[PDB]
Amino acid sequence: EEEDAGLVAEAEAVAAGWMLDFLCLSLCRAFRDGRSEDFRRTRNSAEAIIHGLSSLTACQLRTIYICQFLTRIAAGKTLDAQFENDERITPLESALMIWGSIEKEHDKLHEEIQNLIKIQAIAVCMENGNFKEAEEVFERIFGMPFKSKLLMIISQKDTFHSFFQHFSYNHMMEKIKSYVNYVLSEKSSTFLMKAAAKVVESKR
Amino acid sequence: EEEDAGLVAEAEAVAAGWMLDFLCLSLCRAFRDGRSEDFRRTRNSAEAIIHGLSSLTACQLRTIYICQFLTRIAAGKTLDAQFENDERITPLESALMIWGSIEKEHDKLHEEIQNLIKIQAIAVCMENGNFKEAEEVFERIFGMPFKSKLLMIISQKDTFHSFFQHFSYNHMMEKIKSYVNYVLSEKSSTFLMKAAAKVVESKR
Ligand SMILES: CCNC(=O)Nc1cc(C)on1
Ligand SMILES: CCNC(=O)Nc1cc(C)on1
């Protein structure tokens, strides 16, 4: 009776792990497709399953990081959203912190995404008229040539500067979607999705 | 590409259906064991998965009703909780409405649970000093001998009446747990639980 309760709890943890991978895959897919409402509802389902999980494997932690990363990128223009205990950290700064924590390859795409997030973390502050906040995000991020141009743009209050059009929010989203495509191909073979795809195929 | 999106959405619906049955089973188990915190977190996970489901089978609707029923029974003493658009309906009245809607056998246990919920819907109002609310719940529920004693108890403001000890809140919970045991045996063979149990067993 006591050992049965233990086996049940172990079975619940296995199922929660399969649910986390499936929800990450659905979240990645909605982000790639720009299905905003499906992304919001999938994010709510992922947050709840995560609260029901205790011990995490390195793989499950990377899966959660990916979910948290896309959540912050989707809210990158919502400066009112507080993702950290320190209320001064903006959503793109929180996404940058997670991007540098994921156990992943630091290839060319990784650094390009990192640098696009840094430029946009400042740019979103400038477009909202938050010039003093843009300087504060700058000090938190850069602590030379790229750094020098950004400080010049902040001091000139050049909200719609041409530099922000070359390294745009759209460009950041497109590069992030390329990475999301790689995560989609890696997680398409997870237990729940494979089994659900086989039922659908068998009905055709 | 368009047909692939359709097949993916169909696979997501199959997986959401398997997740709903698993979460109902975990919710039933936590309610039976009195694991209050596990019940709260499982209820949050079940509500999110339900919002991601559109077309529902008669079986999936009964599964949701069961989840909603246990949620209202668990909050039966929280008179501040509003489970209906009409703010006057108390949690036990909302549980009674769902109990009479489930496509299930109306056996002796069914009517005993129904009658225990009616007595307790009034009793919880009396114990909180809400005597006028107790009369209003009475009018909503009974619209003779059982009805007559209850009206007499309400008019006498007999909060700790002996009748409420014979047909107690504990007695209602115990009878509801007997029904929950039947739901547990029926849903233990659902896809996610069976597959998760087999992985646990194979590791022993
Ligand atoms: C800081 C509170 N918000 C979040 O952590 N959001 C998340 C996390 C995951 C996962 O998805 N949204
Ligand atoms: C009225 C809003 N609250 C609920 O419907 N609660 C539920 C529903 C399910 C399922 O679990 N809790």
From Swiss-Prot, chains A, B:
There is a cross-link at K149 (Glycyl lysine isopeptide (Lys-Gly) (interchain with G-Cter in SUMO2)). It is found in: Nucleus; Cytoplasm, Cytoskeleton, Spindle; Chromosome, Telomere. Changing S155A: Loss of phosphorylation; induction of mitotic entry and apoptosis and increased radiation hypersensitivity of ataxia-telangiectasia cells. Highly expressed and ubiquitous. Isoform Pin2 predominates. Changing L56R: Loss of interaction with FBXO4. Phosphorylated preferentially on Ser-155 in an ATM-dependent manner in response to ionizing DNA damage. Induction: Expression is tightly regulated during the cell cycle; levels are low in G1 and S phase and increase during G2 phase and mitosis. Residues 1-204 are annotated as: TRFH mediates dimerization. The acidic N-terminal domain binds to the ankyrin repeats of TNKS1 and TNKS2. The C-terminal domain binds microtubules. The TRFH dimerization region mediates the interaction with TINF2. Homodimer; can contain both isoforms. Found in a complex with POT1; TINF2 and TNKS1. Interacts with ATM, TINF2, TNKS1, TNKS2, PINX1, NEK2 and MAPRE1. Component of the shelterin complex (telosome) composed of TERF1, TERF2, TINF2, TERF2IP ACD and POT1. Interacts with RLIM (via N-terminus). Interacts with FBXO4. Interaction with TINF2 protects against interaction with FBXO4 and subsequent polyubiquitination and proteasomal degradation. Interacts with GNL3L; this interaction promotes homodimerization. Interacts with TIN2. Interacts with RTEL1. Binds the telomeric double-stranded 5'-TTAGGG-3' repeat and negatively regulates telomere length. Involved in the regulation of the mitotic spindle. Component of the shelterin complex (telosome) that is involved in the regulation of telomere length and protection. Shelterin associates with arrays of double-stranded 5'-TTAGGG-3' repeats added by telomerase and protects chromosome ends; without its protective activity, telomeres are no longer hidden from the DNA damage surveillance and chromosome ends are inappropriately processed by DNA repair pathways. This is Telomeric repeat-binding factor 1. It comes from Homo sapiens. The chain holds residues 60 to 268 of 439 of the full protein.
